[model samples]
Target: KETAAAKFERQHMDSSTSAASSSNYCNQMMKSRNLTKDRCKPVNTFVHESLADVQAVCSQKNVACKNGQTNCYQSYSTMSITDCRETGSSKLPNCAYKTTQANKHIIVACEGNPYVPVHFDASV
Candidate 1:
């Protein structure tokens, strides 16, 4: 079974690629990363930072989760991230995405005894 921490890393973490020059980045990544399986994810984000840095965000400022939980944390420093939004013409199995890169403070939901980011809630 895949742990939440591992899932978060697989889905959102991409330390190697800081900037995506091609517009097809999301389209390729979304499918290659298995996010396009079964159904297309409407919106997703890929964070270009070290796993340690991302994990440390759990110790940052507290914030409310999207579902109203109090376990979210906001990053103190701006991070390099790519936002993937599904195009309107996108359909099942043929998921199309618009990729945009930006630097922003990311809010994430954290959990577990050691405390690590499990879900990306938003970016601000």
Candidate 2:
């Protein structure tokens, strides 16, 4: 019973806290976010910026999406982000992730009439 936008928020948004180099951050986060319920997600990124900050990206710089859609936008400012990549030995029901932290200008696919980020495309 979740909208696409809501799902996107659940998967990517972590605005209120800081990991600050916790190696287990991804492991705890991925599990808490329910991303590990079905299967180990190959990879995911968590945004440290607020939803409003991210939403505002829709109005920043328009760009072509990786999926060939034109509704993408690139953030004008670099935001803190954490990339969670599945470990090589990760297995079902026990998904493991290696955490990587960075500050980058993020690219996201925006949609809806009001224009909001629905998919995180990449970070540069």
Candidate 3:
């Protein structure tokens, strides 16, 4: 009996077709393109502010928002930022996780566009 949100998360995080294709394409593209690496750009991730921040982030980066978008809702939490890492192995700060596992980035809907991600890679 999964709730609507839960169902949305399951679907978003579920990667059966696209992931496989992405990996295959990446390997071929890298070799053909003669590139050392094709680091997938960290696309924008979104979460419903009504959802728990940490869990939402984990779900977004690790589980939810798999297909880039879903039926997930958004909210403005007291803690607004969601931190992320370039590598999956990177550790997320305690303040980032809502319950346990570490998280690295925050997902903010920039310019009021829910799907647009604000990538902040430059150091201030």
Clashing pairs in 1: none
Q: Which pairs clash in model 2?
A: none
Q: Which lDDT tens digits does candidate 2 get at residues 68-118?
A: 879899999999999999999999899999999989999999889777888
The root-mean-square deviation over C-alpha atoms between each candidate and the true structure, in angstroms, is 1.1, 1.1, 14.9
Please name the candidate that would achieve the greatest TM-score relative to the true structure.
Answer: 2
Tens-digit lDDT track of model 3 for 1-124: 7443443333222122212222233323322322223343222122223333424333343212333644232322332222222344423221111111122244322122233222222110
**Model 1: which ten-residue window has the lowest total lDDT?**
13-22
lDDT of 1 by residue, 1-124 (tens): 9999899998999888877668999999898779989999999999989999999999999987779989999999999999999999999878999999999999999999879988998899
Q: What lDDT score belongs to each candidate, Candidate 1 first? A: 0.92, 0.90, 0.28
Q: Model 1, which residues run further than 4 Å from truth?
A: none
Largest lDDT belongs to which candidate?
A: 1
Better structure of 2 and 3 per lDDT: 2
Whole-model lDDT, model 3: 0.28
TM-score of 3: 0.18
Q: What TM-score against the true fold does each predicted structure earn?
A: 0.94, 0.95, 0.18
Error of 3 at 116 (Å): 20
